[PDB]
Design an enzyme around this catalytic site. Structure first.
Site, short mmCIF file in Angstrom:
data_model
loop_
_atom_site.label_atom_id
_atom_site.label_comp_id
_atom_site.label_asym_id
_atom_site.label_seq_id
_atom_site.Cartn_x
_atom_site.Cartn_y
_atom_site.Cartn_z
N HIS A 275 0.82 -1.21 0.00
CA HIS A 275 0.00 0.00 0.00
C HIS A 275 0.85 1.25 0.00
N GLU B 241 4.60 7.90 5.54
CA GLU B 241 5.69 7.83 6.49
C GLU B 241 6.83 8.72 6.01
N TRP C 142 4.06 2.21 13.27
CA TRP C 142 4.87 2.71 14.38
C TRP C 142 4.21 2.64 15.75
N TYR D 56 14.50 9.02 12.89
CA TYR D 56 14.61 9.51 11.51
C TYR D 56 14.37 11.00 11.26
N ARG E 12 31.83 14.44 -3.09
CA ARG E 12 31.88 13.06 -2.67
C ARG E 12 31.43 12.94 -1.22
N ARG E 13 30.82 14.01 -0.71
CA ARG E 13 30.33 14.00 0.66
C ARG E 13 28.88 14.48 0.78
N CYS F 231 17.31 1.63 11.23
CA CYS F 231 17.62 0.46 10.41
C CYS F 231 18.23 0.98 9.12
N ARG G 40 21.69 -1.19 8.39
CA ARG G 40 22.35 -2.06 9.36
C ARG G 40 21.55 -3.32 9.72
N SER G 41 20.23 -3.23 9.64
CA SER G 41 19.37 -4.37 9.97
C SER G 41 18.20 -4.40 8.99
N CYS G 42 17.90 -5.58 8.45
CA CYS G 42 16.79 -5.68 7.52
C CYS G 42 15.92 -6.92 7.62
N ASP G 43 14.63 -6.67 7.89
CA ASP G 43 13.61 -7.70 7.99
C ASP G 43 13.21 -7.92 6.53
N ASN H 15 10.96 -0.10 2.55
CA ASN H 15 12.15 0.75 2.55
C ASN H 15 12.61 1.02 1.12
N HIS I 100 18.30 -10.42 7.52
CA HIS I 100 17.67 -11.63 8.04
C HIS I 100 16.22 -11.92 7.67
C1 LIG Z 1 10.90 -6.64 13.47
C2 LIG Z 1 10.54 -5.43 12.69
N1 LIG Z 1 10.34 -4.31 13.33
C3 LIG Z 1 9.98 -3.05 12.69
C4 LIG Z 1 9.79 -1.89 13.46
C5 LIG Z 1 9.45 -0.65 12.88
C6 LIG Z 1 9.31 -0.51 11.48
C7 LIG Z 1 8.99 0.76 10.90
C8 LIG Z 1 8.87 0.91 9.51
C9 LIG Z 1 9.07 -0.22 8.66
C10 LIG Z 1 8.97 -0.17 7.12
N2 LIG Z 1 8.12 0.86 6.52
C11 LIG Z 1 6.67 0.70 6.51
C12 LIG Z 1 5.76 1.64 5.96
C13 LIG Z 1 4.37 1.40 5.98
C14 LIG Z 1 3.90 0.18 6.59
C15 LIG Z 1 4.80 -0.73 7.13
C16 LIG Z 1 6.16 -0.51 7.12
C17 LIG Z 1 4.19 -2.11 6.89
N3 LIG Z 1 2.72 -1.73 6.85
C18 LIG Z 1 1.66 -2.87 6.89
C19 LIG Z 1 0.61 -2.49 8.08
C20 LIG Z 1 1.37 -2.42 9.52
C21 LIG Z 1 0.46 -1.72 10.57
O1 LIG Z 1 0.06 -0.50 10.07
O2 LIG Z 1 0.18 -2.20 11.69
C22 LIG Z 1 0.98 -3.00 5.43
O3 LIG Z 1 1.15 -4.04 4.76
O4 LIG Z 1 0.20 -1.89 5.13
C23 LIG Z 1 2.53 -0.40 6.78
O5 LIG Z 1 1.58 0.37 6.75
C24 LIG Z 1 9.37 -1.51 9.20
C25 LIG Z 1 9.51 -1.68 10.61
C26 LIG Z 1 9.84 -2.98 11.23
C27 LIG Z 1 10.09 -4.39 10.50
O6 LIG Z 1 10.01 -4.54 9.29
N4 LIG Z 1 10.41 -5.48 11.24
C1 LIG Z 2 40.17 9.67 2.12
C2 LIG Z 2 40.88 9.00 3.40
N1 LIG Z 2 41.11 9.83 4.50
O1 LIG Z 2 41.12 11.09 4.50
O2 LIG Z 2 41.33 9.39 5.64
C3 LIG Z 2 41.29 7.45 3.32
O3 LIG Z 2 41.72 6.85 4.29
N2 LIG Z 2 41.15 6.81 2.07
C4 LIG Z 2 40.71 7.35 0.86
O4 LIG Z 2 40.56 6.66 -0.09
N3 LIG Z 2 40.43 8.76 0.81
C5 LIG Z 2 40.51 9.70 -0.38
C6 LIG Z 2 39.30 9.54 -1.32
C7 LIG Z 2 39.35 10.84 -2.13
O5 LIG Z 2 40.07 10.79 -3.35
C8 LIG Z 2 39.92 11.90 -1.19
C9 LIG Z 2 39.13 13.00 -0.49
O6 LIG Z 2 38.11 13.68 -1.22
P1 LIG Z 2 36.67 14.14 -0.74
O7 LIG Z 2 36.82 14.48 0.71
O8 LIG Z 2 35.88 12.89 -0.92
O9 LIG Z 2 36.09 15.25 -1.56
O10 LIG Z 2 40.66 11.11 -0.21
C1 LIG Z 3 13.89 -1.75 11.15
C2 LIG Z 3 13.08 -0.55 10.39
N1 LIG Z 3 12.85 0.63 11.10
O1 LIG Z 3 13.18 0.88 12.28
O2 LIG Z 3 12.26 1.61 10.60
C3 LIG Z 3 12.90 -0.70 8.81
O3 LIG Z 3 12.69 0.28 8.12
N2 LIG Z 3 12.99 -2.01 8.27
C4 LIG Z 3 13.63 -3.13 8.83
O4 LIG Z 3 13.84 -4.06 8.12
N3 LIG Z 3 13.98 -3.08 10.24
C5 LIG Z 3 13.92 -4.23 11.20
C6 LIG Z 3 15.21 -5.05 11.12
C7 LIG Z 3 15.18 -5.81 12.43
O5 LIG Z 3 14.47 -7.03 12.33
C8 LIG Z 3 14.56 -4.83 13.42
C9 LIG Z 3 15.42 -3.89 14.25
O6 LIG Z 3 16.10 -4.53 15.28
P1 LIG Z 3 17.45 -4.21 16.07
O7 LIG Z 3 18.41 -4.45 14.95
O8 LIG Z 3 17.67 -5.12 17.22
O9 LIG Z 3 17.29 -2.83 16.59
O10 LIG Z 3 13.61 -4.12 12.61
#
Ligand SMILES: Cc1nc2ccc3ccc(CNc4ccc5c(c4)CN([C@@H](CCC(=O)O)C(=O)O)C5=O)cc3c2c(=O)[nH]1
Ligand SMILES: *[C@H]1C([N+](=O)[O-])C(=O)NC(=O)N1[C@H]1C[C@H](O)[C@@H](COP(=O)(O)O)O1
Ligand SMILES: *[C@H]1[C@@H]([N+](=O)[O-])C(=O)NC(=O)N1[C@H]1C[C@H](O)[C@@H](COP(=O)(O)O)O1
Ligand SMILES: Cc1nc2ccc3ccc(CNc4ccc5c(c4)CN([C@@H](CCC(=O)O)C(=O)O)C5=O)cc3c2c(=O)[nH]1
Lengths: 264, 264
Positions: free
Chosen positions: B51, B58, B80, B94, B126-127, B146, B166-169, B177, B207
């Site tokens: 949806h 969001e 949420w 966020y 590049r930043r 996440c 860093r973490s993905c369901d 996402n 995961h």
């Molecule tokens: C373990 C786990 N925890 C989470 C905690 C918070 C999150 C916040 C956002 C999102 C991803 N973004 C969206 C954005 C919109 C919707 C949902 C997620 C999923 N969702 C369900 C309904 C969920 C509900 O509204 O209760 C749908 O299918 O419509 C939403 O409305 C995932 C998590 C997770 C996640 O995926 N997994």
């Molecule tokens: C930047 C770097 N550092 O400053 O610590 C390192 O350890 N490795 C790199 O590859 N590195 C390079 C990438 C790029 O060519 C330049 C910096 O440019 P900008 O800040 O990205 O505009 O340094």
């Molecule tokens: C977390 C999430 N969010 O916080 O908005 C999102 O957008 N999608 C995810 O996939 N996500 C999941 C991954 C994991 O299963 C948990 C977070 O757990 P911790 O890594 O212990 O914090 O939610």
């Protein structure tokens, strides 16, 4: 290395012509991943000699939370002279953020210690991260972190690490960043009684400077050699107590080095 | 989508059981990368209904700098809910870090507008980054980001984006996402007069929860369909001026939904 050379050829075949900060021009690509199974050996490039002293000293430097090239000098490391100020200071770069991320309420968070404790007490955590990307202090940094964000992962007593590099001087910097984080994983694994796992490298703006074409072609024609092995001959009582002598590396039979100018 | 479906297959083949904090048990892998050429179509999964309503809301919510569920509620989005305090406050998550990351010297940085100014005057930078991973306020958040770090890139008049999660369901969150950031790329691009390029997804602990296997297999046994098309019908004066109505999705003929219990 296999992956290293493929990434290089890729920039050549796919890189886009971009005008950069230094006004030198580069061949760039966006997004790329490399995996390194540490079980197979230390990822120190063999198609080009690299001094481990360089790598080993800067890393210990970070773990110290130091942002002043003084130390780096007392050991002949100079790559950080150009940017440091009159007093050899670079600002709140890497070290400062790793060891003392300043909170807005006036405190400090030691990411490394935290990470150490998370590994030891909660290896399944998916929040085992440490980033140098401190938006609040970037302006104060002599330069924005290139390797700015990494995360640790544990599975079956194995310790892995994924590094996110926003900017990457493929020819000059990459070989060093790889070895550095590869060396840090080993340290962490030793202080946490874990076995080393994979070192995943992810990059953003991955580039090759236009005035490195020649050196690259040269390096691209050399055959890689078996990866060496990292030997740590002593276990300090902490991760902040390692020293240069502690590390050793055998099996490193690299090709001679290749000199190339740095872009300022 | 092929990429999404192959990812699911991958975690099932090379995954490894791991015990997460919710004590639900997952099957995870570490490190992965997928690219989506927004030119080929809008990346909204078809092997399972989604949806757009919720996604959009969001996102608009993030762009607002709002971290209170009230808005989401006034619009039937309730994902949420579970994490909101008695006042619908999630803490500095966020939206807050995006529009107002707090510095140590009493300042506040709007990472969103910043990026917009960069995509306009220095697209070769590049930043061009936006980080939600604020080590300082992590303890005040209901959840640790996440999708915590992203970077933009420009080449040939096309805006690309790479996200580090860093973490993905993989079953629950990933679909949303993906569509969400893809949605942000089209918006940015429109404000900057650019063309949409690639959206690169990179993950840490990727995961699949145990109670999600039968479903991921059912979905995995489906043929994907042609990606829908995104149509914006108005170019607002600023990226912060989009309304739900401006967005029009076309040709979306998905399979039926599939229910799976979220892991608290
Ligand atoms: C373990 C786990 N925890 C989470 C905690 C918070 C999150 C916040 C956002 C999102 C991803 N973004 C969206 C954005 C919109 C919707 C949902 C997620 C999923 N969702 C369900 C309904 C969920 C509900 O509204 O209760 C749908 O299918 O419509 C939403 O409305 C995932 C998590 C997770 C996640 O995926 N997994
Ligand atoms: C930047 C770097 N550092 O400053 O610590 C390192 O350890 N490795 C790199 O590859 N590195 C390079 C990438 C790029 O060519 C330049 C910096 O440019 P900008 O800040 O990205 O505009 O340094
Ligand atoms: C977390 C999430 N969010 O916080 O908005 C999102 O957008 N999608 C995810 O996939 N996500 C999941 C991954 C994991 O299963 C948990 C977070 O757990 P911790 O890594 O212990 O914090 O939610
Ligand atoms: C354009 C550009 N700018 C930079 C700015 C700062 C950097 C800081 C660290 C590193 C990578 N890490 C190390 C760590 C130690 C050494 C050097 C780099 C390279 N180096 C010798 C070469 C040593 C060798 O070939 O083994 C030199 O003076 O270049 C060092 O002592 C790269 C950059 C770049 C970089 O690679 N490119």
């Amino acid at each position: 290395m296999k992956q290293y050379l493929e990434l290089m050829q890729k920039v050549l075949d796919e890189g886009t012509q971009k005008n950069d900060r230094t006004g030198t021009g580069t061949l760039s690509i966006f997004g790329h991943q490399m995996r390194f199974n540490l079980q197979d050996g230390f990822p120190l490039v063999t198609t080009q000699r690299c001094h481990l002293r360089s790598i080993i000293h800067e890393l210990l430097w970070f773990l110290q939370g130091d942002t002043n090239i003084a130390y780096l000098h007392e050991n002949n490391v100079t790559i950080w002279d150009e940017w440091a100020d009159e007093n050899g200071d670079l600002g709140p770069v890497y070290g400062k953020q790793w060891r003392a991320w300043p909170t807005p309420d006036g405190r400090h968070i030691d990411q490394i210690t935290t990470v150490l404790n998370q590994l030891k007490n909660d290896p399944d955590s998916r929040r085992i991260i440490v980033s140098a990307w401190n938006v609040g202090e970037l302006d104060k940094m002599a330069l924005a972190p290139c390797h700015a964000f990494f995360q640790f992962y544990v599975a079956d007593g194995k310790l892995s690490c994924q590094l996110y590099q926003r900017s990457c001087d493929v020819f000059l910097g990459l070989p060093f960043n790889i070895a550095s984080y590869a060396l840090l994983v080993h340290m962490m694994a030793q202080q946490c009684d874990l076995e080393v796992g994979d070192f995943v490298w992810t990059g953003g703006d991955t580039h090759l400077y236009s005035n490195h074409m020649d050196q690259t072609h040269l390096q691209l024609s050399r055959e890689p050699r078996p990866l060496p092995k990292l030997i740590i001959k002593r276990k300090p009582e902490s991760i902040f107590d390692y020293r240069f002598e502690d590390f050793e590396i055998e099996g490193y039979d690299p090709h001679p080095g290749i000199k190339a100018p740095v872009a300022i």
